[PDB]
Amino acid sequence: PCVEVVPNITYQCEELNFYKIPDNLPFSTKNLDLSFNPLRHLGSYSFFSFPELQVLDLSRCEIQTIEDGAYQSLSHLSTLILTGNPIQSLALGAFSGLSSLQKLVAVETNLASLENFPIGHLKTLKELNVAHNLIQSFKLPEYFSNLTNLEHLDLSSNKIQSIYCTDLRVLHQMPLLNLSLDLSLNPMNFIQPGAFKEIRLKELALDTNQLKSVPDGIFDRLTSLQKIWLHTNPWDCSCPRIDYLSRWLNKNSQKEQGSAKCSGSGKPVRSIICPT
Ligand SMILES: *[C@@H]1O[C@H](CO)[C@@H](O[C@@H]2O[C@H](CO)[C@@H](O[C@@H]3O[C@H](CO)[C@@H](O)[C@H](O)[C@@H]3O)[C@H](O)[C@H]2NC(C)=O)[C@H](O)[C@H]1NC(C)=O
Ligand SMILES: *[C@@H]1O[C@H](CO)[C@@H](O)[C@H](O)[C@H]1NC(C)=O
């Protein structure tokens, strides 16, 4: 049926027209690629014959629902990819048993909020990619206080329009060493003052949004910052509004990735010098 890539270790089962998890596979399998298969639903213990799973790819499997305890057995799974599944229902315990999950990829899974996302138990989670979804709020649920290992959070291409100070409230009780935050390609046109106060970010992606200006000293408390994207935004370079950001981008050209340009001229924000 599938295609053995690594004996008793890795197999390729995509494009085979499967509706159920294959059984004619070594119970030692570590990596399984079940992508592009009409699984439709995932009941409890859907992966029982795979106690040795570390990587599971379920991308585009027409999955509509994941019941409670779907991966209950997979206790050694570190990477789970669910990209492209039209999830119309996610059980409270859908991710029960995943006590070693480090990477959860849920791009394009009709995710509308992070509140009803049963991941508050995956304390080992390091990377959460929920890009290309319907998330409208950047309000990080309280359960994010237990994900003390998260270093990558990709919320790009969603429906976030603002960034309030309360949004990152949770990130003050952990801590979180090197957290790379992507919020690019969002209908974002507003950021609230000090929204990143007492916050420690290594990378910040805010490019290709709807930003015309940002609060003064918005990036004051941020010495852990190594990279930042702000390019492709309708920056208003009228002074003294663009004063703070022009000075900052110029005095931090190394960090900045790409180039934030003025709207109506194309001039780099870092080049603008506001008169006192
Ligand atoms: C892939 O997994 C298979 C099992 O599904 C491995 O083959 C099996 O290897 C064991 C050895 O650990 C064999 O069991 C017994 O081994 C002793 C050696 O002391 C021997 O005296 C017995 O006669 C018996 O062979 C078992 O028969 C064998 N089964 C198969 C599939 O033929 C295999 O080693 C794994 N692939 C690798 C990493 O080589
Ligand atoms: C935090 O996450 C842990 C994971 O073991 C869970 O038991 C707990 O309910 C969550 N909230 C609390 C009480 O800290």
Numbering used by the authors: 28 to 303
Copied sentences from the primary study:
In an attempt to prevent the systemic immune response caused by LPS, a TLR4 decoy receptor was constructed by combining LRR modules from the TLR4 ectodomain and VLR. The constructed decoy receptor was shown to attenuate the TLR4-mediated signaling process by trapping MD2, implicating a potential therapeutics for bacteria-induced sepsis and inflammation.
It is likely that the M41E and S62E mutations would induce strong interactions with positively charged Arg-68 and Lys-109 of MD2. For this, we determined the crystal structures of the single mutants in free form at a −2.4 Å resolution. However, the M41E mutant exhibited an increase of 86.31 kJ/mol in the Coulomb interaction and a decrease of the LJ potential by 4.53 kJ/mol, respectively. Thus, an increase in the binding affinity of the M41E mutant was likely to come mainly from the increased charge interaction.
